[PDB]
Amino acid sequence: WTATSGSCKGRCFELQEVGPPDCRCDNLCKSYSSCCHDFDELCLKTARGWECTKDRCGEVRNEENACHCSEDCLSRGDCCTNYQVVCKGESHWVDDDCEEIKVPECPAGFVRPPLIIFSVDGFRASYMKKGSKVMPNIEKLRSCGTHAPYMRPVYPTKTFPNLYTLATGLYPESHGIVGNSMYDPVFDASFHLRGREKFNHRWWGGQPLWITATKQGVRAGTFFWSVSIPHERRILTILQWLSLPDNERPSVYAFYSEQPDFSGHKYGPFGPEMTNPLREIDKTVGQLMDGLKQLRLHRCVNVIFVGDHGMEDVTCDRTEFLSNYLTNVDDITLVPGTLGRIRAKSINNSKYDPKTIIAALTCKKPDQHFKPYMKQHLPKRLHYANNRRIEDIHLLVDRRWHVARKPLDVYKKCFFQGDHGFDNKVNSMQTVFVGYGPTFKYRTKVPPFENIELYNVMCDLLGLKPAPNNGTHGSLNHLLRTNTFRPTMPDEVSRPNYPGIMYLQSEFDLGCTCDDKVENKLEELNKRLHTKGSTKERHLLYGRPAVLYRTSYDILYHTDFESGYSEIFLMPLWTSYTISKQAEVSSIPEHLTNCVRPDVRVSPGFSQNCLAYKNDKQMSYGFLFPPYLSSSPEAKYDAFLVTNMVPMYPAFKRVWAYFQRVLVKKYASERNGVNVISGPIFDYNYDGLRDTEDEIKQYVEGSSIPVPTHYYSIITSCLDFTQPADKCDGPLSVSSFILPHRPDNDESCNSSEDESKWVEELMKMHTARVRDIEHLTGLDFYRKTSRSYSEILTLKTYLHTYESE
Ligand SMILES: *[C@@H]1O[C@H](CO)[C@@H](O[C@@H]2O[C@H](CO)[C@@H](O[C@@H]3O[C@H](CO[C@H]4O[C@H](CO)[C@@H](O)[C@H](O[C@H]5O[C@H](CO)[C@@H](O)[C@H](O)[C@@H]5O[C@H]5O[C@H](CO)[C@@H](O)[C@H](O)[C@@H]5O)[C@@H]4O)[C@@H](O)[C@H](O[C@H]4O[C@H](CO)[C@@H](O)[C@H](O)[C@@H]4O[C@H]4O[C@H](CO)[C@@H](O)[C@H](O)[C@@H]4O)[C@@H]3O)[C@H](O)[C@H]2NC(C)=O)[C@H](O)[C@H]1NC(C)=O
Ligand SMILES: Cc1nnn(Cc2cc(C(F)(F)F)ccc2/C=C/C(=O)N2C[C@@H]3CN(C(=O)c4ccc(S(N)(=O)=O)cc4F)C[C@H]3C2)n1
Ligand SMILES: [Ca+2]
Ligand SMILES: [Ca+2]
Ligand SMILES: [Cl-]
Ligand SMILES: [K+]
Ligand code: NA
Ligand SMILES: [Zn+2]
């Protein structure tokens, strides 16, 4: 109940929200059906429209008008945004040359430049180039300010997850808004776009920017707008708040537009009907900038123009139906559309089996336009599994397609020509970023970055300490003229041991054999120097990784590679090696095929054994440094050390062997040498973080050798590819992957074919940032380079996406 008979007199768009049943006058009252009776009359005035005209100049103030053109309007802060243009011969902001804003030029009483976030729903990245003729105000912000060619949204590329990610710096799995539609089984409650459940505070985790600001003494405008408040009114409201007295005036504001998304759904991303929505958005920006200029705030405010996701072509005919695959289709609940999430219709049905559902959906039609996954098997780059609101079974849908349960769903719900929600690497899902103001750089283009990073920067813009989040703070310092955040590298927690030769061959009873009993003073000092680290500067180019947790490990040096060997996990945490452009691939010689050699630096007690692998009918082994790339027949013996061995399913060995035999050499030839760091990852609880030993769910049968869930590689070279990787004077280039360590290749529908037809495609799917690997291993890479730390942070957040232009 709301006692709707209080009044909004003097209260219009109040910043503090009042408690039921006292009636509300805030920008969300409409959404709750709680506005006072006179809200429309007093707060949503429309009389005479939104622009001054020649005859309205110097009028007698009429309080009924939507905005004002009387002499006193500037001091009242409620002029139409074109007042000075029409009535005082001023130029529109867009018609002024741009001029570097070196320092904030603010009215007296401003403690810090205000931040205005101008957010646009569905604004695809290519609209900046493709709509440029019709968006002069936006183009001026873009060319005069700082801009990225695009900004990567989070998955799923829907509105609710992405706007809340912008607000919090968190992945959807951590903030809890994991789709536009959700069932939380602990609450037994559903979140929907239409309706009231979504207003309950229990859905919304982390700490959004407006709360971070308020907790630290920085006042915030209310971020959310009721759909029926027109855009012109939202802008006028912001401009009115900017005219408040110093003690009342917010420092951070958001505008939100439902366009161009609303139209993109109806007409597709480039429908001819899309020109008008873009024009209209540009006019809104024009009104804000003209309004700021009137208040002498146009060289004081930092403006961020940002989208939540892009828009793809999708029609009703491009729908796959689960009824074409599943006999039991009525025992499931599907969250449908541009992703799928499946659970049991009833938790009382004991005959429901996710294993048989996955199998019935796997590689069943030649051109199948979705791929099923257990959520823990989704590419790690999506960070989309550690939340009870995410269903165990997930369908990754091809761009341009929909999934639905039954045909009746689609025609008893062609309406739409656009949609979004697909994998966040998809080019059509990319969105925009422009920053303009005293704190942003002047006429600067920056590389593409992920929207998880912006919370930190918005905190920096407002002098706030960010709540803990998934950004890497400092990785976007290159956007900023000042207020940069200068982090220190994390402190190493565990130092390595450097073991020498301490064990005799005969102390090892591992059930391993090697054909190697084949016998010089020139070449004996040589192998000794290699074991003491004499080639370490060739294979460990950026320093050894730092171990950021408590553990026992050894550094092992070799001619061709260096490793950090874990005594707890009985394998390397990392293995580092450089392959020059000139390097030769050799084969594993016949006598060495099943060779595993004891490592005399490492106790039998801290070693793997061959017998465990023989006994484990499911599990085989591979090597982290590939024997194929040994520098010499003598150096090849090192690659067969039991300390270079890791557990591998035979199906995974197909993948790994092709990467090591073919792909590494290929990249070295293309990139002018590469440095490779490879290793295992253990993430049995799918939280994106390194497991402790007591989290491991699988061991090689009858041993304490833990089985990795994934294998990573980080492949680094010179950005200037005219310089070899080992003699690089400037910025670096990286690509990485986190491959799932799976006992089958069901993920790859063409896997019966030659590895040259499917392996590289799999690797591309599981592309990763270095930072993803850091979270998953507790390691910190690139500790010793000549480069600035912020530059290295940017490098660690880089994702190689394998999408064309
Ligand atoms: C992305 O960045 C984020 C933010 O930094 C990273 O997320 C953090 O990860 C930490 C490690 O997993 C985690 O720390 C835990 O905090 C627990 C206290 O939690 C509450 O308080 C915080 C602070 O206010 C709050 O943010 C939390 O909010 C979460 O949960 C609510 C539900 O109430 C949601 O509304 C909200 O969306 C958010 O959900 C997410 O996090 C939880 C886990 O916390 C997930 O389950 C959800 O799916 C969702 O993703 C909380 O309200 C604290 O209890 C934990 O301590 C246990 O574990 C340690 C290990 O050190 C152990 O020593 C302790 O004894 C303790 O164990 C005991 O409890 C166990 C569980 O019941 C039990 O098994 C044991 O036997 C013990 O008795 C832990 O310290 C932190 O909360 C989150 N924060 C957020 C916001 O998500 C994230 O890791 C980054 N991602 C990547 C890939 O890097
Ligand atoms: C969600 C959410 N989380 N946090 N916010 C507040 C917010 C943050 C930021 C920013 F960038 F600064 F973080 C900027 C602006 C804001 C403020 C935003 C705001 O007033 N809204 C966003 C809501 C979305 N909405 C819909 O009905 C809707 C649902 C789905 C789709 S779809 N098909 O595209 O998926 C489109 C839609 F329009 C009601 C809008 C009112 N909204
Ligand atoms: Ca949206
Ligand atoms: Ca984990
Ligand atoms: Cl959803
Ligand atoms: K075996
Ligand atoms: Na297959
Ligand atoms: Zn949409």
PDB file of C-alpha atoms in Angstrom, residues 256-444:
ATOM      1  CA  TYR A 256      20.553   5.509 -19.726  1.00  0.00           C
ATOM      2  CA  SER A 257      19.001   5.084 -23.167  1.00  0.00           C
ATOM      3  CA  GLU A 258      16.901   2.063 -24.267  1.00  0.00           C
ATOM      4  CA  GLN A 259      18.056   2.906 -27.817  1.00  0.00           C
ATOM      5  CA  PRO A 260      19.518   1.784 -30.127  1.00  0.00           C
ATOM      6  CA  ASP A 261      18.726  -1.705 -28.661  1.00  0.00           C
ATOM      7  CA  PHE A 262      14.932  -1.254 -28.757  1.00  0.00           C
ATOM      8  CA  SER A 263      14.951  -0.596 -32.489  1.00  0.00           C
ATOM      9  CA  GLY A 264      17.815  -3.090 -33.208  1.00  0.00           C
ATOM     10  CA  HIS A 265      15.617  -5.934 -31.991  1.00  0.00           C
ATOM     11  CA  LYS A 266      12.822  -4.965 -34.460  1.00  0.00           C
ATOM     12  CA  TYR A 267      14.982  -4.081 -37.490  1.00  0.00           C
ATOM     13  CA  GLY A 268      18.353  -5.791 -37.085  1.00  0.00           C
ATOM     14  CA  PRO A 269      21.628  -4.013 -36.317  1.00  0.00           C
ATOM     15  CA  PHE A 270      21.856  -2.228 -39.714  1.00  0.00           C
ATOM     16  CA  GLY A 271      18.203  -2.025 -40.735  1.00  0.00           C
ATOM     17  CA  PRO A 272      17.473   1.255 -42.627  1.00  0.00           C
ATOM     18  CA  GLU A 273      15.163   2.164 -39.697  1.00  0.00           C
ATOM     19  CA  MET A 274      18.348   2.311 -37.468  1.00  0.00           C
ATOM     20  CA  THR A 275      19.517   5.704 -38.750  1.00  0.00           C
ATOM     21  CA  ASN A 276      16.820   7.661 -36.863  1.00  0.00           C
ATOM     22  CA  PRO A 277      17.536   6.106 -33.369  1.00  0.00           C
ATOM     23  CA  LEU A 278      21.250   6.967 -33.859  1.00  0.00           C
ATOM     24  CA  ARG A 279      20.412  10.551 -34.843  1.00  0.00           C
ATOM     25  CA  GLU A 280      18.153  10.857 -31.807  1.00  0.00           C
ATOM     26  CA  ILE A 281      20.883   9.565 -29.422  1.00  0.00           C
ATOM     27  CA  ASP A 282      23.280  12.063 -30.913  1.00  0.00           C
ATOM     28  CA  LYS A 283      20.848  14.871 -30.370  1.00  0.00           C
ATOM     29  CA  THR A 284      20.552  13.830 -26.655  1.00  0.00           C
ATOM     30  CA  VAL A 285      24.386  14.030 -26.271  1.00  0.00           C
ATOM     31  CA  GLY A 286      24.194  17.456 -27.966  1.00  0.00           C
ATOM     32  CA  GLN A 287      21.643  18.593 -25.395  1.00  0.00           C
ATOM     33  CA  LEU A 288      23.849  17.422 -22.465  1.00  0.00           C
ATOM     34  CA  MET A 289      26.966  19.126 -23.867  1.00  0.00           C
ATOM     35  CA  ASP A 290      25.105  22.379 -24.654  1.00  0.00           C
ATOM     36  CA  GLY A 291      23.597  22.212 -21.204  1.00  0.00           C
ATOM     37  CA  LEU A 292      27.035  21.664 -19.599  1.00  0.00           C
ATOM     38  CA  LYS A 293      28.484  24.502 -21.664  1.00  0.00           C
ATOM     39  CA  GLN A 294      25.716  26.907 -20.347  1.00  0.00           C
ATOM     40  CA  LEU A 295      26.604  25.930 -16.803  1.00  0.00           C
ATOM     41  CA  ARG A 296      30.360  26.459 -17.637  1.00  0.00           C
ATOM     42  CA  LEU A 297      30.852  22.752 -16.903  1.00  0.00           C
ATOM     43  CA  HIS A 298      31.886  21.577 -20.367  1.00  0.00           C
ATOM     44  CA  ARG A 299      35.637  21.648 -19.419  1.00  0.00           C
ATOM     45  CA  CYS A 300      35.033  20.410 -15.866  1.00  0.00           C
ATOM     46  CA  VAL A 301      32.963  17.166 -16.190  1.00  0.00           C
ATOM     47  CA  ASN A 302      34.394  13.770 -17.230  1.00  0.00           C
ATOM     48  CA  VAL A 303      31.891  12.152 -19.618  1.00  0.00           C
ATOM     49  CA  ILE A 304      31.937   8.421 -20.389  1.00  0.00           C
ATOM     50  CA  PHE A 305      29.900   7.273 -23.378  1.00  0.00           C
ATOM     51  CA  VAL A 306      29.591   3.530 -23.010  1.00  0.00           C
ATOM     52  CA  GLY A 307      27.479   0.641 -24.307  1.00  0.00           C
ATOM     53  CA  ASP A 308      26.422  -2.561 -22.633  1.00  0.00           C
ATOM     54  CA  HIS A 309      26.589  -4.988 -25.693  1.00  0.00           C
ATOM     55  CA  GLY A 310      26.133  -4.901 -29.493  1.00  0.00           C
ATOM     56  CA  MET A 311      23.432  -6.524 -31.719  1.00  0.00           C
ATOM     57  CA  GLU A 312      23.427  -9.321 -34.276  1.00  0.00           C
ATOM     58  CA  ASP A 313      21.046 -10.372 -37.127  1.00  0.00           C
ATOM     59  CA  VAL A 314      18.726 -13.080 -35.771  1.00  0.00           C
ATOM     60  CA  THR A 315      15.354 -14.178 -37.241  1.00  0.00           C
ATOM     61  CA  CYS A 316      12.638 -16.767 -36.206  1.00  0.00           C
ATOM     62  CA  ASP A 317      13.659 -19.172 -38.946  1.00  0.00           C
ATOM     63  CA  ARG A 318      17.151 -19.508 -37.397  1.00  0.00           C
ATOM     64  CA  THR A 319      15.915 -21.469 -34.394  1.00  0.00           C
ATOM     65  CA  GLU A 320      16.996 -24.930 -33.316  1.00  0.00           C
ATOM     66  CA  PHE A 321      14.438 -26.883 -31.285  1.00  0.00           C
ATOM     67  CA  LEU A 322      15.273 -29.181 -28.434  1.00  0.00           C
ATOM     68  CA  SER A 323      12.216 -31.256 -29.473  1.00  0.00           C
ATOM     69  CA  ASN A 324      14.248 -32.334 -32.550  1.00  0.00           C
ATOM     70  CA  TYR A 325      16.854 -33.997 -30.268  1.00  0.00           C
ATOM     71  CA  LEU A 326      15.136 -34.956 -27.022  1.00  0.00           C
ATOM     72  CA  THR A 327      12.331 -37.502 -26.517  1.00  0.00           C
ATOM     73  CA  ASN A 328      11.763 -36.319 -22.873  1.00  0.00           C
ATOM     74  CA  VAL A 329      11.417 -32.583 -23.826  1.00  0.00           C
ATOM     75  CA  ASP A 330       8.584 -32.031 -21.233  1.00  0.00           C
ATOM     76  CA  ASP A 331      10.763 -33.104 -18.276  1.00  0.00           C
ATOM     77  CA  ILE A 332      13.068 -30.061 -18.863  1.00  0.00           C
ATOM     78  CA  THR A 333      12.888 -26.314 -18.276  1.00  0.00           C
ATOM     79  CA  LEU A 334      14.931 -24.302 -20.814  1.00  0.00           C
ATOM     80  CA  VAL A 335      16.043 -20.679 -20.522  1.00  0.00           C
ATOM     81  CA  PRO A 336      15.920 -20.021 -24.308  1.00  0.00           C
ATOM     82  CA  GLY A 337      17.201 -17.612 -26.978  1.00  0.00           C
ATOM     83  CA  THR A 338      20.792 -16.678 -27.675  1.00  0.00           C
ATOM     84  CA  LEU A 339      22.028 -19.022 -24.920  1.00  0.00           C
ATOM     85  CA  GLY A 340      20.441 -22.049 -23.366  1.00  0.00           C
ATOM     86  CA  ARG A 341      20.279 -23.103 -19.734  1.00  0.00           C
ATOM     87  CA  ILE A 342      18.604 -26.449 -18.922  1.00  0.00           C
ATOM     88  CA  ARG A 343      17.371 -27.879 -15.644  1.00  0.00           C
ATOM     89  CA  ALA A 344      14.819 -30.594 -14.619  1.00  0.00           C
ATOM     90  CA  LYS A 345      11.166 -29.428 -14.715  1.00  0.00           C
ATOM     91  CA  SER A 346      10.634 -31.231 -11.386  1.00  0.00           C
ATOM     92  CA  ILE A 347      13.250 -32.047  -8.673  1.00  0.00           C
ATOM     93  CA  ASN A 348      10.924 -34.944  -7.710  1.00  0.00           C
ATOM     94  CA  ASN A 349      11.707 -36.724 -11.053  1.00  0.00           C
ATOM     95  CA  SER A 350      14.476 -39.296 -10.290  1.00  0.00           C
ATOM     96  CA  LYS A 351      14.574 -40.416 -13.990  1.00  0.00           C
ATOM     97  CA  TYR A 352      16.019 -37.042 -15.133  1.00  0.00           C
ATOM     98  CA  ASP A 353      19.720 -37.523 -16.094  1.00  0.00           C
ATOM     99  CA  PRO A 354      21.984 -34.637 -17.270  1.00  0.00           C
ATOM    100  CA  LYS A 355      24.475 -37.139 -18.771  1.00  0.00           C
ATOM    101  CA  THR A 356      21.906 -38.500 -21.214  1.00  0.00           C
ATOM    102  CA  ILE A 357      20.625 -35.013 -22.058  1.00  0.00           C
ATOM    103  CA  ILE A 358      24.165 -33.817 -22.924  1.00  0.00           C
ATOM    104  CA  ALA A 359      24.761 -36.906 -25.103  1.00  0.00           C
ATOM    105  CA  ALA A 360      21.402 -36.476 -26.932  1.00  0.00           C
ATOM    106  CA  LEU A 361      22.444 -32.856 -27.776  1.00  0.00           C
ATOM    107  CA  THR A 362      26.019 -33.630 -28.878  1.00  0.00           C
ATOM    108  CA  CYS A 363      27.045 -33.433 -32.547  1.00  0.00           C
ATOM    109  CA  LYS A 364      23.691 -34.830 -33.734  1.00  0.00           C
ATOM    110  CA  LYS A 365      23.150 -32.773 -36.935  1.00  0.00           C
ATOM    111  CA  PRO A 366      25.913 -31.871 -39.445  1.00  0.00           C
ATOM    112  CA  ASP A 367      25.504 -28.076 -39.182  1.00  0.00           C
ATOM    113  CA  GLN A 368      24.205 -28.033 -35.560  1.00  0.00           C
ATOM    114  CA  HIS A 369      23.951 -24.372 -34.388  1.00  0.00           C
ATOM    115  CA  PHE A 370      24.518 -24.828 -30.638  1.00  0.00           C
ATOM    116  CA  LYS A 371      26.916 -26.891 -28.543  1.00  0.00           C
ATOM    117  CA  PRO A 372      26.033 -28.326 -25.177  1.00  0.00           C
ATOM    118  CA  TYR A 373      28.324 -28.060 -22.109  1.00  0.00           C
ATOM    119  CA  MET A 374      28.435 -28.954 -18.459  1.00  0.00           C
ATOM    120  CA  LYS A 375      29.064 -25.390 -17.105  1.00  0.00           C
ATOM    121  CA  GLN A 376      32.487 -26.342 -15.705  1.00  0.00           C
ATOM    122  CA  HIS A 377      33.563 -27.248 -19.263  1.00  0.00           C
ATOM    123  CA  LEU A 378      32.718 -23.865 -20.761  1.00  0.00           C
ATOM    124  CA  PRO A 379      35.829 -21.863 -21.914  1.00  0.00           C
ATOM    125  CA  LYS A 380      37.388 -20.408 -18.800  1.00  0.00           C
ATOM    126  CA  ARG A 381      37.512 -16.966 -20.413  1.00  0.00           C
ATOM    127  CA  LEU A 382      33.719 -16.730 -19.951  1.00  0.00           C
ATOM    128  CA  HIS A 383      33.983 -17.043 -16.143  1.00  0.00           C
ATOM    129  CA  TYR A 384      30.447 -18.474 -16.210  1.00  0.00           C
ATOM    130  CA  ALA A 385      29.978 -21.299 -13.720  1.00  0.00           C
ATOM    131  CA  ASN A 386      30.523 -20.366 -10.047  1.00  0.00           C
ATOM    132  CA  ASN A 387      26.927 -19.448  -9.148  1.00  0.00           C
ATOM    133  CA  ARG A 388      23.990 -21.610  -8.075  1.00  0.00           C
ATOM    134  CA  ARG A 389      21.823 -19.509 -10.454  1.00  0.00           C
ATOM    135  CA  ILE A 390      23.729 -20.913 -13.452  1.00  0.00           C
ATOM    136  CA  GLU A 391      22.255 -24.253 -14.566  1.00  0.00           C
ATOM    137  CA  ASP A 392      24.613 -27.254 -14.815  1.00  0.00           C
ATOM    138  CA  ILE A 393      23.730 -27.709 -18.505  1.00  0.00           C
ATOM    139  CA  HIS A 394      24.529 -24.843 -20.821  1.00  0.00           C
ATOM    140  CA  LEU A 395      24.103 -24.344 -24.545  1.00  0.00           C
ATOM    141  CA  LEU A 396      26.467 -22.067 -26.372  1.00  0.00           C
ATOM    142  CA  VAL A 397      24.474 -20.820 -29.350  1.00  0.00           C
ATOM    143  CA  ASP A 398      26.033 -19.869 -32.704  1.00  0.00           C
ATOM    144  CA  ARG A 399      25.891 -16.200 -33.621  1.00  0.00           C
ATOM    145  CA  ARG A 400      22.733 -15.429 -35.696  1.00  0.00           C
ATOM    146  CA  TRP A 401      20.777 -18.335 -34.062  1.00  0.00           C
ATOM    147  CA  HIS A 402      18.288 -19.058 -31.294  1.00  0.00           C
ATOM    148  CA  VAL A 403      17.557 -22.228 -29.311  1.00  0.00           C
ATOM    149  CA  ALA A 404      14.005 -23.023 -28.084  1.00  0.00           C
ATOM    150  CA  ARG A 405      12.400 -26.074 -26.469  1.00  0.00           C
ATOM    151  CA  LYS A 406       9.483 -26.602 -28.963  1.00  0.00           C
ATOM    152  CA  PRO A 407       8.277 -24.841 -32.141  1.00  0.00           C
ATOM    153  CA  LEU A 408       5.120 -23.684 -30.300  1.00  0.00           C
ATOM    154  CA  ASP A 409       7.346 -21.440 -28.088  1.00  0.00           C
ATOM    155  CA  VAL A 410       8.497 -19.380 -31.131  1.00  0.00           C
ATOM    156  CA  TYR A 411       5.071 -18.827 -32.889  1.00  0.00           C
ATOM    157  CA  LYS A 412       2.849 -18.907 -29.659  1.00  0.00           C
ATOM    158  CA  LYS A 413       5.010 -16.474 -27.549  1.00  0.00           C
ATOM    159  CA  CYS A 414       8.383 -13.191 -37.432  1.00  0.00           C
ATOM    160  CA  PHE A 415       8.612 -10.316 -34.953  1.00  0.00           C
ATOM    161  CA  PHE A 416      12.350  -9.613 -34.370  1.00  0.00           C
ATOM    162  CA  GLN A 417      15.314  -9.151 -36.695  1.00  0.00           C
ATOM    163  CA  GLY A 418      18.078  -8.545 -34.077  1.00  0.00           C
ATOM    164  CA  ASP A 419      19.225 -10.094 -30.821  1.00  0.00           C
ATOM    165  CA  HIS A 420      22.317 -10.443 -28.567  1.00  0.00           C
ATOM    166  CA  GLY A 421      23.489 -12.593 -25.645  1.00  0.00           C
ATOM    167  CA  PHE A 422      26.077 -14.676 -27.577  1.00  0.00           C
ATOM    168  CA  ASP A 423      29.708 -15.492 -26.605  1.00  0.00           C
ATOM    169  CA  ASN A 424      31.426 -12.169 -25.720  1.00  0.00           C
ATOM    170  CA  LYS A 425      34.232 -12.629 -28.240  1.00  0.00           C
ATOM    171  CA  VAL A 426      31.716 -12.391 -31.164  1.00  0.00           C
ATOM    172  CA  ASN A 427      32.391  -9.228 -33.231  1.00  0.00           C
ATOM    173  CA  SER A 428      28.739  -8.178 -33.412  1.00  0.00           C
ATOM    174  CA  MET A 429      28.501  -8.274 -29.539  1.00  0.00           C
ATOM    175  CA  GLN A 430      31.308  -5.658 -29.081  1.00  0.00           C
ATOM    176  CA  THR A 431      30.270  -2.279 -27.847  1.00  0.00           C
ATOM    177  CA  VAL A 432      31.720   1.215 -27.393  1.00  0.00           C
ATOM    178  CA  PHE A 433      33.783   3.311 -25.029  1.00  0.00           C
ATOM    179  CA  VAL A 434      34.691   7.024 -25.197  1.00  0.00           C
ATOM    180  CA  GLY A 435      35.980   9.091 -22.275  1.00  0.00           C
ATOM    181  CA  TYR A 436      36.063  12.859 -22.553  1.00  0.00           C
ATOM    182  CA  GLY A 437      37.157  15.414 -19.997  1.00  0.00           C
ATOM    183  CA  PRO A 438      40.047  16.853 -17.938  1.00  0.00           C
ATOM    184  CA  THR A 439      41.013  13.460 -16.476  1.00  0.00           C
ATOM    185  CA  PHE A 440      40.963  11.586 -19.841  1.00  0.00           C
ATOM    186  CA  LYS A 441      43.724  11.949 -22.404  1.00  0.00           C
ATOM    187  CA  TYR A 442      43.412  14.212 -25.439  1.00  0.00           C
ATOM    188  CA  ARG A 443      42.847  12.755 -28.984  1.00  0.00           C
ATOM    189  CA  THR A 444      44.036   9.322 -27.886  1.00  0.00           C
TER     190      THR A 444
END
